[PDB]
Enzyme design. Structure first.
Site, PDB file in Angstrom:
ATOM      1  N   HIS A  75       0.827  -1.201   0.000  1.00 15.16           N
ATOM      2  CA  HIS A  75       0.000   0.000   0.000  1.00 15.16           C
ATOM      3  C   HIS A  75       0.852   1.237   0.000  1.00 15.16           C
ATOM      4  O   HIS A  75       2.083   1.134   0.067  1.00 15.16           O
ATOM      5  CB  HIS A  75      -1.020  -0.005   1.137  1.00 15.16           C
ATOM      6  CG  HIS A  75      -0.452   0.343   2.495  1.00 15.16           C
ATOM      7  ND1 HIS A  75       0.768  -0.039   2.892  1.00 15.16           N
ATOM      8  CD2 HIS A  75      -1.013   1.031   3.567  1.00 15.16           C
ATOM      9  CE1 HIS A  75       0.986   0.397   4.142  1.00 15.16           C
ATOM     10  NE2 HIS A  75      -0.106   1.046   4.552  1.00 15.16           N
ATOM     11  N   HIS A  77       1.347   3.957   2.032  1.00 11.07           N
ATOM     12  CA  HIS A  77       2.040   4.525   3.165  1.00 11.07           C
ATOM     13  C   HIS A  77       3.514   4.212   3.116  1.00 11.07           C
ATOM     14  O   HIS A  77       3.941   3.192   2.575  1.00 11.07           O
ATOM     15  CB  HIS A  77       1.443   4.062   4.487  1.00 11.07           C
ATOM     16  CG  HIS A  77       0.074   4.629   4.780  1.00 11.07           C
ATOM     17  ND1 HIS A  77      -0.823   3.986   5.534  1.00 11.07           N
ATOM     18  CD2 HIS A  77      -0.529   5.817   4.385  1.00 11.07           C
ATOM     19  CE1 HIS A  77      -1.937   4.715   5.631  1.00 11.07           C
ATOM     20  NE2 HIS A  77      -1.760   5.837   4.924  1.00 11.07           N
ATOM     21  N   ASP A  79       5.545   3.026   5.160  1.00  9.10           N
ATOM     22  CA  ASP A  79       6.187   1.855   5.736  1.00  9.10           C
ATOM     23  C   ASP A  79       6.166   0.641   4.811  1.00  9.10           C
ATOM     24  O   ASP A  79       6.742  -0.391   5.117  1.00  9.10           O
ATOM     25  CB  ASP A  79       5.599   1.525   7.103  1.00  9.10           C
ATOM     26  CG  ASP A  79       4.136   1.170   7.049  1.00  9.10           C
ATOM     27  OD1 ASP A  79       3.455   1.470   6.058  1.00  9.10           O
ATOM     28  OD2 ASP A  79       3.676   0.588   8.029  1.00  9.10           O
ATOM     29  N   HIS A 137      -7.895  -0.494   5.188  1.00  9.79           N
ATOM     30  CA  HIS A 137      -6.931   0.363   5.852  1.00  9.79           C
ATOM     31  C   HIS A 137      -6.658   1.573   5.006  1.00  9.79           C
ATOM     32  O   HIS A 137      -6.583   2.707   5.513  1.00  9.79           O
ATOM     33  CB  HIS A 137      -5.651  -0.421   6.123  1.00  9.79           C
ATOM     34  CG  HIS A 137      -4.483   0.430   6.549  1.00  9.79           C
ATOM     35  ND1 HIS A 137      -4.420   1.023   7.746  1.00  9.79           N
ATOM     36  CD2 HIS A 137      -3.299   0.752   5.891  1.00  9.79           C
ATOM     37  CE1 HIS A 137      -3.268   1.706   7.847  1.00  9.79           C
ATOM     38  NE2 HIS A 137      -2.584   1.534   6.714  1.00  9.79           N
ATOM     39  N   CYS A 156      -0.866  -4.116   6.242  1.00  7.79           N
ATOM     40  CA  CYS A 156      -1.503  -3.232   7.165  1.00  7.79           C
ATOM     41  C   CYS A 156      -3.021  -3.342   7.194  1.00  7.79           C
ATOM     42  O   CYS A 156      -3.674  -2.616   7.938  1.00  7.79           O
ATOM     43  CB  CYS A 156      -1.105  -1.816   6.805  1.00  7.79           C
ATOM     44  SG  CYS A 156       0.766  -1.679   6.805  1.00  7.79           S
ATOM     45  N   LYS A 159      -5.560  -6.387  11.143  1.00 15.33           N
ATOM     46  CA  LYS A 159      -5.583  -5.582  12.353  1.00 15.33           C
ATOM     47  C   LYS A 159      -6.357  -6.318  13.421  1.00 15.33           C
ATOM     48  O   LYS A 159      -7.513  -6.015  13.674  1.00 15.33           O
ATOM     49  CB  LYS A 159      -6.261  -4.243  12.077  1.00 15.33           C
ATOM     50  CG  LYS A 159      -5.445  -3.284  11.231  1.00 15.33           C
ATOM     51  CD  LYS A 159      -4.226  -2.808  11.993  1.00 15.33           C
ATOM     52  CE  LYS A 159      -3.482  -1.722  11.240  1.00 15.33           C
ATOM     53  NZ  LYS A 159      -2.358  -1.229  12.075  1.00 15.33           N
ATOM     54  N   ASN A 165      -4.650   3.777  12.740  1.00 13.86           N
ATOM     55  CA  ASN A 165      -4.947   5.090  12.186  1.00 13.86           C
ATOM     56  C   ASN A 165      -5.901   4.976  11.027  1.00 13.86           C
ATOM     57  O   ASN A 165      -5.569   4.318  10.074  1.00 13.86           O
ATOM     58  CB  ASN A 165      -3.664   5.738  11.691  1.00 13.86           C
ATOM     59  CG  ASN A 165      -3.847   7.162  11.295  1.00 13.86           C
ATOM     60  OD1 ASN A 165      -4.970   7.625  11.067  1.00 13.86           O
ATOM     61  ND2 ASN A 165      -2.729   7.894  11.221  1.00 13.86           N
ATOM     62  N   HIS A 195       2.010  -5.130  11.587  1.00 14.30           N
ATOM     63  CA  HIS A 195       2.260  -4.462  12.851  1.00 14.30           C
ATOM     64  C   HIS A 195       2.044  -5.319  14.136  1.00 14.30           C
ATOM     65  O   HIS A 195       2.067  -4.815  15.263  1.00 14.30           O
ATOM     66  CB  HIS A 195       1.495  -3.135  12.907  1.00 14.30           C
ATOM     67  CG  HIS A 195       1.843  -2.176  11.794  1.00 14.30           C
ATOM     68  ND1 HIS A 195       3.124  -1.685  11.610  1.00 14.30           N
ATOM     69  CD2 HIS A 195       1.086  -1.627  10.811  1.00 14.30           C
ATOM     70  CE1 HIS A 195       3.125  -0.846  10.583  1.00 14.30           C
ATOM     71  NE2 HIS A 195       1.912  -0.812  10.062  1.00 14.30           N
TER      72      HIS A 195
HETATM   73  C1  LIG Z   1       2.152   4.795  10.510  1.00 14.96           C
HETATM   74  C2  LIG Z   1       1.524   3.445  10.215  1.00 14.96           C
HETATM   75  C3  LIG Z   1       1.283   3.319   8.740  1.00 14.96           C
HETATM   76  S1  LIG Z   1       0.234   1.881   8.390  1.00 14.96           S
HETATM   77  C4  LIG Z   1       0.227   3.391  10.951  1.00 14.96           C
HETATM   78  O1  LIG Z   1      -0.723   3.990  10.540  1.00 14.96           O
HETATM   79  N1  LIG Z   1       0.128   2.629  12.184  1.00 14.96           N
HETATM   80  C5  LIG Z   1       1.201   1.876  12.773  1.00 14.96           C
HETATM   81  C6  LIG Z   1       0.838   1.706  14.214  1.00 14.96           C
HETATM   82  C7  LIG Z   1      -0.445   2.425  14.383  1.00 14.96           C
HETATM   83  C8  LIG Z   1      -1.021   2.477  13.005  1.00 14.96           C
HETATM   84  C9  LIG Z   1      -1.566   1.163  12.742  1.00 14.96           C
HETATM   85  O2  LIG Z   1      -1.193   0.214  13.434  1.00 14.96           O
HETATM   86  O3  LIG Z   1      -2.411   1.050  11.799  1.00 14.96           O
HETATM   87 ZN   LIG Z   2      -0.719   2.130   6.248  1.00 19.89          ZN
HETATM   88 ZN   LIG Z   3       1.488  -0.046   8.237  1.00 23.52          ZN
END
Ligand SMILES: C[C@H](CS)C(=O)N1CCC[C@@H]1C(=O)O
Ligand SMILES: [Zn+2]
Ligand SMILES: [Zn+2]
Length: 219
Positions: A75, A77, A79, A137, A156, A159, A165, A195
């Site tokens: 995706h 983002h 990361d 997401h 991502c 979850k 986020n 994550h």
């Molecule tokens: C910054 C990343 C990009 S997926 C994010 O949005 N996060 C990482 C930890 C909190 C949130 C997530 O877990 O979806």
């Molecule tokens: Zn993301």
């Molecule tokens: Zn992510």
């Protein structure tokens, strides 16, 4: 200080790379991706947050005799995509979905060299498949399936404990996307989230429950 890049074997031909970033408003966030080996070639599933870690990751494999054939980003983002600019500079082919490239463009980021549209895309015939379950997401999120191992890289989108986020999320679509994913890859042996820790197919059920809960809470 942040922990260093970690690279660990997960299955025959499949390694998990974990990178770490301090994220404004979220704290230190671990990010998992994969490296998939086919013969003497390596494929990156997602890039680490930074060019520095992307180079470390690439070097680790090059040292062990592999050629880096491609990268695919799950995706838009950072990361999943932060190393695209560096890989492109080295003429390593990079792949992303059309929707991802469009979001990268709008976000002021370097796009993948190669893109694809539609629901199924074979990065490597019979070995690496990219699947788009629908918005969740983010509008563009895709997953990566290794049929030889029944391993799903959910990125991502997966979850299990809470959605995180929602800034770019589609809360109305996520439950339908998650149901589609669970019906498709319900037989997964391993599911690898971005994550949280690697799990079995149950992570698909939990993501669905969380998406349903999130939509309810939004109403
Ligand atoms: C910054 C990343 C990009 S997926 C994010 O949005 N996060 C990482 C930890 C909190 C949130 C997530 O877990 O979806
Ligand atoms: Zn993301
Ligand atoms: Zn992510």
């Amino acid at each position: 200080s942040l922990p260093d890049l970690k690279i660990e074997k997960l299955d025959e031909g499949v390694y998990v790379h974990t990178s770490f970033e301090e994220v404004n408003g979220w704290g230190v966030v671990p990010k998992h991706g994969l490296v998939v080996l086919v013969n003497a070639e390596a494929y990156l599933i997602d890039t680490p947050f930074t060019a520095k870690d992307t180079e470390k990751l690439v070097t680790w494999f090059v040292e062990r005799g592999y050629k880096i054939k491609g990268s695919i980003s799950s995706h838009f983002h950072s990361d999943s995509t932060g190393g695209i600019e560096w890989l492109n500079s080295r003429s390593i082919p990079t792949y992303a979905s059309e929707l991802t490239n469009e979001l990268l463009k709008k976000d002021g980021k370097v796009q993948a060299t190669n893109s694809f549209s539609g629901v199924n895309y074979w990065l490597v015939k019979n070995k690496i498949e990219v699947f788009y379950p629908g918005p969740g997401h983010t509008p563009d999120n895709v997953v990566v399936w290794l049929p030889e191992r029944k391993i799903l890289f959910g990125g991502c989108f997966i979850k299990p404990y809470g959605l995180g986020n929602l800034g770019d999320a589609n809360i109305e679509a996520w439950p339908k996307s998650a149901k589609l994913l669970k019906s498709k890859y319900g037989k997964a042996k391993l599911v690898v989230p971005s994550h949280s820790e690697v799990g079995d197919a149950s992570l698909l059920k939990l993501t669905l429950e969380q998406a349903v809960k999130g939509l309810n809470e939004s109403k």
